[PDB]
Design a protein around this ligand. Structure first.
Ligand code: 4M5
Lengths: 261, 11
């Protein structure tokens, strides 16, 4: 019972974006939406964007989006390591265990986590300051279009559940710590951790969503689906670095990506 | 092999 709240509390501090806020905003002005290249350039120009993007100058709309995407990943991955630390008994794990879980984990956790800002119409950007059309993301020249859509497809089915922030935190913690990941020093401590974290979900679902008694099976399924998406994501990212002269990968992202697929 | 990640945890 203590474990569950501790994850919720840890999750709340670490992540700027939570489900309530994304849903709520969607309040003097609505988040500026980008449905077009023209709109993107103007959105790109504005003071907030300039402040928070690292001042990217690439000259390719598709290239800038892919680089702009990266700020979110680095930002999320950094937050994920902190979340992992908060989880009881994660601190214990050996550096090979902690790092290995994170490298596989960070992208799986994000995709489930990404959903809350996501909408069938669009996804929130710049801490909710901006909205980008799903159509517009899909329009971008290959292979840049491919990355956003399946994540959205997963997002549509995943959103439907539907999970409070407490639910996610438990889900996320489970994703982060997996016995299966390659090269783990100890299988038993992670597996023991998973059981604890996963058990909490079971107790949690019964009080929280009495209306759905089957949530855990469906929720568990998502991890298998998520695993494929990271594989699919990884393969795509690899394409860009080889195919495109222009695209650039953050040092942290390279370490995570390398050896993952 | 994972400089950034080791640094992140240790700080
Ligand atoms: C830069 C332009 C666009 C940023 C668009 C999307 C990034 C959001 C999420 C990406 C998440 C994960 C990436 C996955 C990966 O690459 O590995 C700045 C800009 O103009 C937008 C700012 C405000 C909009 C009003």
């Amino acid at each position: 019972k203590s474990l569950a709240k501790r994850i919720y509390e840890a999750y709340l501090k670490n992540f700027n974006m939570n489900k309530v806020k994304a849903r709520v905003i969607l309040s003097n002005n609505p988040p500026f939406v980008i449905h077009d290249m023209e709109t993107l350039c103007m959105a790109e120009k504005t003071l907030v964007a300039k402040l928070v993007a690292n001042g990217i100058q690439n000259k390719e709309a598709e290239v800038r989006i892919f680089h702009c995407c990266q700020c979110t990943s680095v930002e999320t991955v950094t937050e994920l390591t902190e979340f992992a630390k908060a989880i009881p008994g994660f601190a214990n794990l050996d550096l090979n265990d902690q790092v290995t879980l994170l490298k596989y984990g960070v992208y799986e956790a994000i995709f489930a986590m990404l959903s809350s800002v996501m909408n069938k119409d669009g996804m929130l950007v710049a801490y909710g300051n901006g909205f980008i059309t799903r159509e517009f993301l899909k329009s971008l020249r290959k292979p840049f279009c491919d990355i956003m859509e399946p994540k959205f497809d997963f997002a549509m089915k995943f959103n439907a559940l539907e999970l409070d922030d407490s639910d996610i935190s438990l889900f996320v913690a489970a994703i982060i710590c997996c016995g299966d990941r390659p090269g783990l020093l100890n299988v038993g401590h992670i597996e023991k951790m998973q059981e604890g974290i996963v058990h909490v979900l079971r107790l949690h679902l019964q009080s929280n969503h009495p209306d759905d008694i089957f949530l855990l099976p469906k929720l568990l399924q998502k991890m298998a689906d998520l695993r494929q998406l990271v594989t699919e994501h990884a393969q795509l990212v690899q394409i860009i670095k080889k195919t495109e002269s222009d695209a650039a990968l953050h040092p942290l992202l390279q370490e995570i990506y390398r050896d993952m697929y | 092999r994972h400089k950034i990640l080791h640094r992140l945890l240790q700080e």
